[model samples]
Target: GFARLKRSLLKTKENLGSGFISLFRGKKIDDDLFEELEEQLLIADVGVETTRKIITNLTEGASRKQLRDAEALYGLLKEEMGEILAKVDEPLNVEGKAPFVILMVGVNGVGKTTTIGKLARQFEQQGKSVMLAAGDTFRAAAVEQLQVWGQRNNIPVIAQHTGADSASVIFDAIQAAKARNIDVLIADTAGRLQNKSHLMEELKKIVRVMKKLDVEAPHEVMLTIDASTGQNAVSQAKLFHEAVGLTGITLTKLDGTAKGGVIFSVADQFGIPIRYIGVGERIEDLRPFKADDFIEALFARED
Candidate 1:
């Protein structure tokens, strides 16, 4: 598992792992080192506030003689990042409630639909009966894509014609899941609209509609974010959380970008549980987020 995670972090390692090692190797803990550390984190796409907090903490440690050398500071740096991720390392739990609903949301091309498919398959393999709601009726092909995944996996998918109300389709899917005694129901939603408020309004309406069936429906409002988007992902998380209150997050495309540092900023900011991370294209690459494993993978040496 660590090997897979290490490989998936190849791109990010180029900037974060190697950069950190080179920056601190044979160097003393000084103001210059701290400055370079800040720049390195920023280059890796860690947001301004989070990077500042990290630098501040490390600087304080150096002044207090807690970090005697650059190598010591390096270890401390890893621990600081680990602490940030640990706060949001919670995984999604589908037990306790039958038909545990997960409302998947994100902007276009963030792999929301694909992540849903991967999650459904993962849940099914765990012996949970999973259903999908093609609530992204905004795109004809979106529904078709989900259907294909359902067909391939033998999972049932609820869908309606293009332009049909997304909330209605999800509502019907909930009813179907309840009747069939499904274990999990994952719902997909349109990611874009004419305006940001419009999209938020649509998501809010869907939440309201789901509550009509079960007050605690949509137990998990999971936002699938493209890790490559970097700081933009932070803004998206803020907006979505303000609107519908996201309960979980899944960062995708980590295997393809150096901007995976955004995960630190996200975890530090919202404190929302990061349910999963998408590494490769394979279904198995969507692994549950483990804070220690992620930090170790990013800082792992090539040899």
Candidate 2:
């Protein structure tokens, strides 16, 4: 598993992990070294504020510990990054409520639908009876795509015709989940930009409708973010969290990107639990975010 995790995080490891190794191999612990590290982190898409906090802590810690070597700083850097991830390393727990509702929200093309399918399959693997809702009725193909996943997985899906109200479809799906006593209900919403007020209002409406069925119907408002979007992902997360009060996050397309350091910025800035990370296209690729494994993967050097 460590090997696979290392391979999956290869792209990010090269840029942030190996790159630092080279920089620190013969370097000294000085302002110049920190300046170079700062530039590299920003280039890797670690946000400004997050990077600043990391550097500040490292500087103070290095001073406090009386360390003057790049090697010591390297170990400290790894530890600092791990701590940031640890704060948001919470996994999605669906034990309490019957028909635990997960409202998946994100802009289009962030692999929202695919993530839903993968999640349903994963839940089923854990012996949970899962149901899906095609709430993204904005496009004709959205419902059909969900239906295909449902058919492939042998999971039932609740959907309506093209241009149907998303809230209505999800509402019906919730009622069905309650009736059948399903373990989890993963609902999909139409991918709309964060800037669109109308789409956000529609999301608010969906939440309101779900509460009518159960006081805390949407047990989890999970946002799927595209990792390759770099710093833009931070702004997207900010707005989406403001709009829907996201309880969790899943960063997709990590293997395809060289700059996955946005994970640090996100975890530090929001403190929202990172439920999963999609490192590859396979179903098993979307694994839970473990701070220890992730840090080990990050610093894992190539042989």
Candidate 3:
């Protein structure tokens, strides 16, 4: 499993894992070494604020642990990163609410539809009856993609025609889910730029409409973030969370980026629960976020 994790993060490992190995090779601990470590952290797309905090912890730990070797510092770095992730590694729980509604939100082309397909399959495998809501009526392909998944899997999909009211489509889907007594309802939303005020207001409208049907209709508002966007992804998270009150995050496309260090930055900064991670295109590659597994995979190299 760790091997798969390592292979999945091959790009990130190249930037972060091996970088640590190269940085700590036979160097004595000193100001120059710590300075280089700081740069290495930032180079991997670790945010400036997170980098400073990490380096501060490492420096303090090095002093407390009384470590004299470079290898020890490398180990400390992994532990520190793992600790940050550990705080926010909570998995999404669907135990309490019947017809648990998950509102999938993200920008265009960040794999929101794809993740919805994967999640539907995963939830079904967990023995939950699932339905998909094609709420992204703004894009024809978005609705088609979700409908395809529903058709292929024989899961029910509630959708409206392209250019139809997006909120109305999801509102109808929620009503249908309740009527059918579905265990989970995954609703897809139109991909909009985080800076667009009008688009964001539309999202709030969707939430308001859902409340009319059931006070807690959309139980979970999960944001799908692209790890490749690096710091920009963090900003998107902040914006979306402020607008919709995000309950969880699904960070996608880690396999495609060396800047996966953004995962650490987001977790350290927001403290929001990371529900899932998309490592590859395969459905199985979308796994629940596990902090220890991720850290071990990041630093594990073939010896």
Clashes of each: 0, 0, 0
TM-score of 2: 0.95
In candidate 3, stretches whose alpha carbon ends up further than 4 angstroms from where it belongs are: 64-66
Model 2 worst lDDT window (10 residues): 190-199
Tens-digit lDDT string for candidate 1 (1-303): 477787778888876754587778898888888888888889888989999999998898778876666977767778888899999998888997778999999887747878888888888888899999999897998789889889998999999998999999999999999999999999998888359988999999999999888999999999988898889899989988999999999999998788989999999999999999999998888989999888888876753
| TM-score of every model versus the real structure | 0.94, 0.95, 0.93
- Model 1's lDDT to the true fold? 0.88
Model 2 residue 210 distance off true place after TM-score fit, in angstroms: 1.0
In terms of TM-score, which candidate is stronger, 2 or 3?
A: 2
lDDT of 3 at 183: 94
Per-residue lDDT over 36-128 for candidate 2, one digit per residue giving the tens place of the 0 to 100 score: 899989999998999999899999998899987887787888889989999999999987677999999988774777799899989889899
Q: Residue 177 in candidate 2 has what lDDT?
A: 95
RMSD of 3: 1.9
Q: Distance from true position, residue 145, model 3, in Å? A: 2.9
- Give the TM-score ranking, best first: 2, 1, 3
Give per-residue CA lDDT, model 3, range 132-153, as digits (tens).
Answer: 8988787898788778878989
Clashes of 1: 0
| Model 3 collision count | 0
